Structure formats: C-alpha cells, structure tokens
Amino acid sequence: VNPCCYYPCQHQGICVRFGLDRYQCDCTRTGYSGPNCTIPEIWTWLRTTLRPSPSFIHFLLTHGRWLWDFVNATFIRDTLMRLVLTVRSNLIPSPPTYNIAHDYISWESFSNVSYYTRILPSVPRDCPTPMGTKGKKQLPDAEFLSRRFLLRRKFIPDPQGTNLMFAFFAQHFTHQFFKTSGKMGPGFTKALGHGVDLGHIYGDNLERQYQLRLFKDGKLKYQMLNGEVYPPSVEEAPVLMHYPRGIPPQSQMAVGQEVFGLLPGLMLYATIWLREHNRVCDLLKAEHPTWGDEQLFQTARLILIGETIKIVIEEYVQQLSGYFLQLKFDPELLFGAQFQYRNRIAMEFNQLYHWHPLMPDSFRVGPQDYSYEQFLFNTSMLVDYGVEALVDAFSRQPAGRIGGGRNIDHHILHVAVDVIKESRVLRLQPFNEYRKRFGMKPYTSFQELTGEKEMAAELEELYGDIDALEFYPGLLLEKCHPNSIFGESMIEMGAPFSLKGLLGNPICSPEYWKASTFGGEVGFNLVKTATLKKLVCLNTKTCPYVSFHVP
Amino acid sequence: VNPCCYYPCQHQGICVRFGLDRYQCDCTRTGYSGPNCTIPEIWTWLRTTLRPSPSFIHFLLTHGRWLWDFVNATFIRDTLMRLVLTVRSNLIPSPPTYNIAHDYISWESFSNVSYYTRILPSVPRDCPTPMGTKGKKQLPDAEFLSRRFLLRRKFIPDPQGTNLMFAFFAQHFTHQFFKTSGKMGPGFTKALGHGVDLGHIYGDNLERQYQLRLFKDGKLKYQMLNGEVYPPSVEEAPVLMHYPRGIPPQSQMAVGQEVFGLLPGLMLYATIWLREHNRVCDLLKAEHPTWGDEQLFQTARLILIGETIKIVIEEYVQQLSGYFLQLKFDPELLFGAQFQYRNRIAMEFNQLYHWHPLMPDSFRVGPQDYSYEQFLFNTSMLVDYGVEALVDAFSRQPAGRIGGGRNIDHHILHVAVDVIKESRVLRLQPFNEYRKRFGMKPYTSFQELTGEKEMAAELEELYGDIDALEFYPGLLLEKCHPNSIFGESMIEMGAPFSLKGLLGNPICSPEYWKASTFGGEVGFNLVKTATLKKLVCLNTKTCPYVSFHVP
Numbered sequence A, B: 001v002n003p004c005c006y007y008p009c010q011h012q013g014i015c016v017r018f019g020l021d022r023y024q025c026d027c028t029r030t031g032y033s034g035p036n037c038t039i040p041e042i043w044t045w046l047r048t049t050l051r052p053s054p055s056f057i058h059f060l061l062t063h064g065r066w067l068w069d070f071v072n073a074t075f076i077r078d079t080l081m082r083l084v085l086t087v088r089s090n091l092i093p094s095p096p097t098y099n100i101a102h103d104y105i106s107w108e109s110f111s112n113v114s115y116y117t118r119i120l121p122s123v124p125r126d127c128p129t130p131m132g133t134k135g136k137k138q139l140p141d142a143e144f145l146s147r148r149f150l151l152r153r154k155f156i157p158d159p160q161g162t163n164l165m166f167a168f169f170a171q172h173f174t175h176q177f178f179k180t181s182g183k184m185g186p187g188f189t190k191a192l193g194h195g196v197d198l199g200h201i202y203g204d205n206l207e208r209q210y211q212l213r214l215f216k217d218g219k220l221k222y223q224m225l226n227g228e229v230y231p232p233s234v235e236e237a238p239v240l241m242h243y244p245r246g247i248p249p250q251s252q253m254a255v256g257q258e259v260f261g262l263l264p265g266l267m268l269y270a271t272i273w274l275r276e277h278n279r280v281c282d283l284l285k286a287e288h289p290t291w292g293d294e295q296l297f298q299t300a301r302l303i304l305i306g307e308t309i310k311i312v313i314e315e316y317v318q319q320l321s322g323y324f325l326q327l328k329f330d331p332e333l334l335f336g337a338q339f340q341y342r343n344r345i346a347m348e349f350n351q352l353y354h355w356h357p358l359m360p361d362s363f364r365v366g367p368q369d370y371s372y373e374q375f376l377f378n379t380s381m382l383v384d385y386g387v388e389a390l391v392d393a394f395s396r397q398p399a400g401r402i403g404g405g406r407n408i409d410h411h412i413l414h415v416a417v418d419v420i421k422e423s424r425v426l427r428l429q430p431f432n433e434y435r436k437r438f439g440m441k442p443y444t445s446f447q448e449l450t451g452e453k454e455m456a457a458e459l460e461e462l463y464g465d466i467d468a469l470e471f472y473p474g475l476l477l478e479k480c481h482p483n484s485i486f487g488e489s490m491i492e493m494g495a496p497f498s499l500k501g502l503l504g505n506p507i508c509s510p511e512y513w514k515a516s517t518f519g520g521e522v523g524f525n526l527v528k529t530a531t532l533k534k535l536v537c538l539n540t541k542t543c544p545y546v547s548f549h550v551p
C-alpha cells in the first residue's frame, strides 16, 4: 500500500516514494521539521497561535463601519491591502507546480501551457480507496448527489444583494481563462495566457484576433444596428463561434470567446467591452496622430486589461467580500515585496468558480419575464432591448446564493454533475486536504461542515467518512457565514487564486506599470479610475442603473 | 523629422511620440527627472559618482590573489556573488519588453514566445540615417568591413589560456537557446524555452523528444559502437537532422539540436550529456524502484539542467572572467531579493555570442592535424577516436582570442558578414547607445574605441561618426583589457544577459530549489557538486586531461 495515500506530509511538505515501500517528506522551507513536517520552528509556532481564525477576521471586516471609514481614508488602507495581497498570494506556487500528468515538478509541467496546473498532487492511482484510504470503495453517484444536495427547490436569493449584472460579469470574465479543451480532455486548456489577457475579447490566438480586427485605427470590427454599435457578424469576421446548427453566419456575432453567443448576458458584456476598446482607440489617436493601427490596438488592449483588473478588485471582489475595508488596486503596493509576476490557472480554481447557483429561475426584463428556453440561444434579445435596457434589468434582478446547498436551477444542474465527474477523473484530493492546504483545520464531521443535521446525516451515510468528502461538493455544501453569499472555504481557497491571478499579471510589474505603457497620462488614468458605471455609461446613449448590487 | 531618432531620453527613459512633432520621455523609476531624464536624484548621483569604472573593478578582480583567496573562504564570497548577480541582472527588463515587431510594450510581445526580445527599441524606420541622425546615408559594406577588420591573418591565441574544449562547450551550450528560424526570418526563434532547458539534448518540441526517448527507465535512446555508448542513428530515432544530402540515415546521429551533426565537437558534447542522462537515470531508479519511465526521465532532466547551470557559472564564466573572486552557483543567494524567475532571449544577446574567433586554423588530435574540410561534416571522427581522446585533444588546443579584431578564420568569416547584415535588418541601435544602456560612457572617437590609430582612422573614414558604429562590430573591435580574451563591453553587456539567463531559470526559485525536485539528496548533490571533469570522467572508460583551460 502506497504510503503517500495517507497524505502523511503536513504543511506543504512533499511526499516522495523511496525504496520499495518507504516514503519521505521534504519539509524544506515549510517552517516545520520531523518525519511529517509537524514539529514547528519557534517563529512558525508564534505565527500559527497568534493568528485569529478565518471566521474571526471575517467578523472584524464586516463590523464597525465607523472605524473602517476612518481607516479607508489613511495609509492603513494600503498597509492592509498589501497585507491581503501578500498573505493570500504566498499560498499559490509560483513557478507553477504539478499538472494532470505529473504529480511532481518537471520541465514539461513548467513549460507546457496547455495544461491547467494543480495545487495538490492527485490521489495516487494505486490507493485503497478513490480518495486515498478513507470512504467507500465507490464514490456516491454524481447524479444523485446533485439532485439530493445541489438542486434548487425554492429560489434562494443572495443575502448580500448581488445581482445578475454581477453574475454575467463573472461568467464573462472567468471564461477568458477557463477554457477546458474538449479535444485534449480534462486537465487541458485552450486559454493559454492563463489569466486576465482579455482573450475573450481579442481571441485566444493570433489568427482569430486578426479576423476580429479592423486593422484601421487600432479598432475592432463592428456593425450598426438601430444606430447602435455591436460586434460584427461572422460573415464579416469569419471566426469559429459555437452556435446551434442551423443559425446562419450573417446572424451570428463574432466576439473572441466562441461560447458567448449562447447567452444575451455574455454578448452584452462583449458589446460593452468592444465599444470601450474602440472608444479608447479614439482617445489614443487624438494623443498620438503619428501612431499606426498596431500600436493603437496593442496599447488599447493593455488599457482594457488595466480597467478589467481595476474594476474586478475594487468593485467585483469588493461586492463578494462584503468587507468594510476598501479594497484597492495599486500594483505599487507590491514593489517592495518578493512577488512573481506570472500566473498559471489551476484545475481547482476552475472547479471552485462554477457559480451556477447565481442563475435565477427566469430572467426579468422590465414587464417581460423570459424563461431559460426563451433566453439561452436568443440571437435577437440584445439588439431588441439594447445595452442600456439589459444592464438596467440585470442590475435590478437578484442573483442566487452560491453556498448553502440546494440552489442550482434544474436547467443547468447537469453542469454540477459533470463537474463532480471531472473531479474524479482529475482525481482531486479530498476537501479536507484542501482545507489544510489553505490554512484551515479539516472538518471533523459532516455536521460541522453543514451547520445542520439532516443533510449531514445523509452525506455521512453516503460518503461514510468526512475525509472522503470531495472538493466541489465540500465548497457548495459548507455552512455559509452569517448573511454571506458562501462559506469560508470558498474565500480562503479562492482569494489566493484570484488575487494571484489579478496582480500576477505583467502590466502590474515595475517594468510595465508606467504611463508610457498605456500611451501616456491619459491612458494610465483610464486604468486608475476605471469604474463599472463608466465602462457602461461612457459607451451607451443613456445611463441606466448600473451596479453589481441590487437597488 | 522623428525626434526619437535623436535618442533624447537618457537612463532608460522611454521616448514616446506625441502630437504631430513633439516627444516626451517617461522617466518613471529611472532615478532621474527632466525633459530627457538627465536630472539625477540625490541617491542616483551618489551611486554614479561613488562607483568605480568597469575598468577599475576589473583591475581589483584580477590582482591580489592572496587577498582574494582569503575572501573566497569567508562569507564575503557570498556577499560579492549576490552583488554581482543582482547588479548585473537589474539591467535586464523582466517581464520582457520589445521585439522586432513592437518598439513598445504590448500583450503580444509578452505572450508571443516565437520572438526574440530586444533591450533597446529599433532605430525608427523614418530616421535621416540608418543609425538615427549620425553617420552616412549608407552603411559600410558588410563584406568589406569583415575582410578589413575581422578576417584572421595570423592566428592570435587567447591570452587567458581558453581551449577548444571551452569553445565547443560554448557553441553547444548556447545553441540550446539561440535557434533563429529561417522560415519566420530574423527576430524569431524556435528555441521556445528561452534559456537553459537543455532543449539541445531533449529536443525543442515534445514530438522530437518522444522520438529520442527510450521510454524505458527514463533513458534516452542510444547505440553501441566499439563498446562505447553513442547517440542513436536517425534510423532508430527518426528525427530531423541537418546533414548534407548524400549521407545515409544509418550514419546520421539523432541528438536534439538539428545542427549538431555538423561538428565532432558538438556531437562530442551531445554524447557526453546523453551518457550523463542515462547514468543519472540509473542512480535515480536505485533510489526509487517504484518510479515509472516518465518521472525518471523528467527528474533526470531537471538534474542535468542543474549540473549545466553549476558548471557554466563556476567553471565556464569563471574561465572567461579571469576573476580571482571564486564565483558561485547558489540559488539561495537570491531568496531574500526581488528577482523574477523568467527569461527571454534577446536579439542583442544573440549577436554578442557570435564568438567565432575562438575557432583555430586547424584541429589537432594527437599527431594528426585536421583541416576544416576534414573536420566540418565528419561523421566518423567521434567514433574513430572516442570521447576521451577528443576531450583530451580539445582541452590541449588553445582557442583564439575573441576581441581585438582580425582573428576570425576565413572558413567562417561569412557568419560575421551575415551577422552584420541581420543587424541592419533588425535595425539595432548604435554601439554607443548600448554602451549607455549598459552603464558605460559612449566612446568619443574610434581612437578611444581601439587602443590604436590605424584601424580607427579607417573606421572613421567609413562610418564617418563614432555614433554610427554598429553593435557587433563595436564588440569585436573594442580594445581588450590587459591580457583578456575581449574588451569591457563584451562583459558589461553580456554578463547581465548571461546571469539573468542562468539564475532566471525556474529551478533556481524557492519553489523548485528543493531536494524532492531532484529525486532526493542524491540528485540534489549531483547538481550542487557538478563539475566538468566529473561530467566527462564519470562517463568515459578512462579520464583524460579535461578543462576549459590549456595545460
């Protein structure tokens, strides 16, 4: 029996097979020593005992507004944001570590960008049980697990007021770096780029980009419909878009991410960002009449990347966190720190971001209430209502609570089922192992995981042992913070991936973070003062209610 | 007239075109302010005035052996090595900056690995003269310039005692990251990897690697000849090798770098490293009987990458430098510093590494003296003499002095001619601009460049102005240090690229630099104690005289 199946090495120690049946843990730089890296060094011990729980820190951050208001207007704001940035980031390996093919560092894992990386090695194929040495010989049926604990019965809105404007932003944004390859299989991605490169606007490959570009004034091709600007058609921009068989090219919109024609919300954002790109080109040309099409295009792209990182940290994440602390996007906060400006999307981060519970039972646009069947492959809704109308509608409709269980609409429950199946193919280690990998104590029972007893009893009967609970299921079934959109694990595990992805970008490095990179002071300020409201309203005829929070 | 043609921005300030005819310099973080970034800050001025010249520091490093010996045995050795590593490295942009297509930062320049990067932007195409605003309307004829100042008349040996064992190591080693693509043109490379990835041994692409691997015990395919181990034939390892038409596959060796069959010296190293890879596999399997072929292969590769870095720093660079300071390869020296573990080969670095003057008039192997025509595409010499014999021969024959001028054998003078032509296509800025970009004062005349009067007068008559002198020519014609192999520019410009290349490797990062990465303490020590002598002798029947220095 493979000793590493027991996950003997603690605190990021590395389990290596030695001889026919022995194992050793490489505790290098873990802060611990001993056979299993559990004997702490004096400094390590002080840090671990003097640190408040994720639950207590969360409390401090969502209480005492009056105090935080004072803090948010001083340098303490910076000090804390930097603290948040470094502490969350150090939890992500960089250079990247393993991939679906190698549960060990290798030159292939480091140079081969078609692979998603992974934080914890896989469950060795030769282990007694699917999860290691705990649980039953066979995992609970994915389908059953989903219907029992993930299916929505009664719509549960997000207590934090998150809306569909946010939901679709999330779907739009994440899909620029989550593009699992159907051809290569699980564990592989076509979103080389691995981060905020805006590939969902410009395309994940040159040829597509060239087909999407006007090659005049650095602009992106487009078309006018009802006196409004929209992405061009595939006929004008011959690029592969995944539309239902039968829909003509002249009726398809070409945008960068092949999958965006399958939801008005997605194309909505495609339209907004496309309008913002061409707008920025105008501002740039005014500043540099001697610039060619290429430089105008390249420079505008860097600007939008900046705007995206800005808005994601200061509004998107802010919304999700519900923190009284005013999050801040300022690369300089890291100029005095040891930080690698690179990123590699992890398969776990992909699993974790499946926030389908956000989707509602139906989609309300003014007096009209559209169903999934009327909404999903709708090729006219966006143009019928226009950008302003849809933004207003999505900004008003509440999105569903992510954590807590039983809140995924039956229309898309199938995604969760496949997420669970893919997880087993990827052989993700147990939820508890990830709890530990991210600084939390493992759950000692299902009743501790869920703040209740009914689901816990059934889960325990199915899994047999809390140490067998799988990654994704653990994330969605964990008990949620007070009036939060999800549990602590979602944050403690997601923040590192997210923040490392945002700041790990090259435009955030000392070499790139300069006015000249963005065409000058005008371009640099577009990044620095970017805003959701401005992203929309500076590109629409009228300004509707725009926010990631319900009115 | 494009104002940036004057190279107005100093100290790494960035020239940006504004309005119809204005320009601005982005002095962000340069240590200077002002229209041209020429007004120094207090600390900046202190550093530039309190810093000794490259010539004085070089003096200190090559005198007082007794003092140095004392220092080398103390922590001062680590202190100076860290200084050297950090000061030389900070001179290289990271993330990478421009490429042949973009004289400005862009997402395309950052993500597109098929491009060599460049430290200084190109000479704007719309400038008055080919070099900017100085020199004649037409540059000196490349052919003529080479015959007049680069052609060898009388063989000039390297006063530092460098041998052919070193010369071939350099060619072998560098050809893993300098692989200009004929199909795409100058400015493009096939050596994705941009560094010490050992692609010249394992191939620059997966398919090729696969054809080269045995897929057993993690070993590399091979063949036996005279009881000795050699690389396999193209027949057993069907991989593309550039051999002259007319030679049969059965006499073509397959090695990783398509060009290595064109010199016994190159294949010699191919053989040595191949034997070392398979040897390491043995040691590894002894340690991990449960490991599969893949892990054995991946782990051995990481080990050889380490051995390569170790030897290049402590023996290779040591020999070139001539320093009494004992250089050291220890990744930990940088763990407390702000350093990016990434690298991108620069086109200027490619130009600079054209050390053809190293090649002799003929190749002596014992009593036999072989001509270029008997040496260049010889497919039997390596096997006829065996590894030991050739190593001994190359270790005894002195290589030619690199700097000084008039020392490139007529057989390969054509390379230099093409290097100069490619330079103009790449539109490399003038030598003086690079002097400045690397911390030196520009030469005020050709007489200052060359420590003499004749060549200088002829060069001045051809170029018209010292500010028109080109990159490569400047490097080879600059006056050499006392009894050195080349001038200061070669070191002051090359050291930064070289060390950044070496330490910027991901195996030198905190995440990778651990015993487990190399299979354990045994593998880790192979890296830490790697040696040229051991690389050869631990893989040959007998141990010949092996060194980068003539006996």
Ligand code: HEM
Binding pocket: A167, A168, A170, A171, A172, A174, A178, A179, A180, A263, A350, A353, A354, A355, A356, A358, A359, A412, A414, A415, A418, A419
């Ligand atoms: C009702 C609206 C939505 C529909 C119809 C939908 C549909 C899908 C489908 C069909 C897949 C691929 C499923 C498979 O291969 O089995 C998928 C993947 C995914 N969805 Fe959704 N989704 C919706 C909303 C969202 C939202 C709001 C988010 C939150 C950001 C989200 C995040 C993801 C992620 C992260 C993936 C995996 C991406 C990848 O690996 O390529 N989805 N979704």
Ligand code: HEM
Binding pocket: B167, B168, B170, B171, B172, B174, B178, B179, B180, B350, B353, B354, B355, B356, B358, B359, B412, B414, B415, B418, B419
């Ligand atoms: C007599 C032995 C040698 C021969 C016959 C030779 C031949 C060549 C040839 C034919 C090219 C390509 C020329 C072109 O495209 O116009 C080349 C490139 C080059 N050689 Fe050599 N060379 C020799 C020795 C060396 C040595 C000792 C070094 C020092 C490390 C060296 C470094 C280079 C470099 C850096 C390049 C450019 C690589 C690239 O861009 O792909 N060569 N050599």
Ligand SMILES: CCCCCCCCO[C@@H]1O[C@H](CO)[C@@H](O)[C@H](O)[C@H]1O
Binding pocket: A034, A038, A039, A040, A045
């Ligand atoms: C000043 C020293 C304080 C030591 C208190 C550290 C407490 C943790 O102690 C460690 O717990 C591990 C299990 O969790 C054991 O495996 C280790 O052997 C034990 O040393």
Ligand SMILES: CCCCCCCCO[C@@H]1O[C@H](CO)[C@@H](O)[C@H](O)[C@H]1O
Binding pocket: A052, A053, A054, A055, A057, A058, A060, A061, A080, A083, A084, A086, A087, A088, A089, A091, A438, A439, A440, A492
């Ligand atoms: C007063 C509030 C200060 C907030 C700054 C601390 C930054 C949060 O830091 C995070 O805290 C988690 C525990 O909640 C840990 O599990 C994470 O690893 C750590 O990065």
Ligand SMILES: CCCCCCCCO[C@@H]1O[C@H](CO)[C@@H](O)[C@H](O)[C@H]1O
Binding pocket: B052, B053, B054, B055, B057, B058, B060, B061, B080, B083, B084, B086, B087, B088, B089, B091, B438, B439, B440, B492
């Ligand atoms: C006593 C000698 C100590 C030498 C260690 C200093 C490290 C060398 O450092 C280098 O010096 C050059 C000038 O010589 C500069 O042009 C380079 O930019 C700098 O990195």
Ligand SMILES: CC(C)Cc1ccc([C@H](C)C(=O)O)cc1
Binding pocket: A084, A088, A317, A320, A321, A327, A490, A491, A494, A495, A496, A498, A499
């Ligand atoms: C879940 C994740 C994708 C979003 C997220 C939420 C909160 C935070 C804050 C700054 C933190 O570090 O606690 C970061 C990122």
Ligand SMILES: CC(C)Cc1ccc([C@H](C)C(=O)O)cc1
Binding pocket: B084, B088, B317, B320, B321, B327, B490, B491, B494, B495, B496, B498, B499
């Ligand atoms: C020219 C270059 C390719 C080799 C080289 C020579 C000397 C040094 C020393 C440590 C230095 O920094 O002066 C580094 C690299």
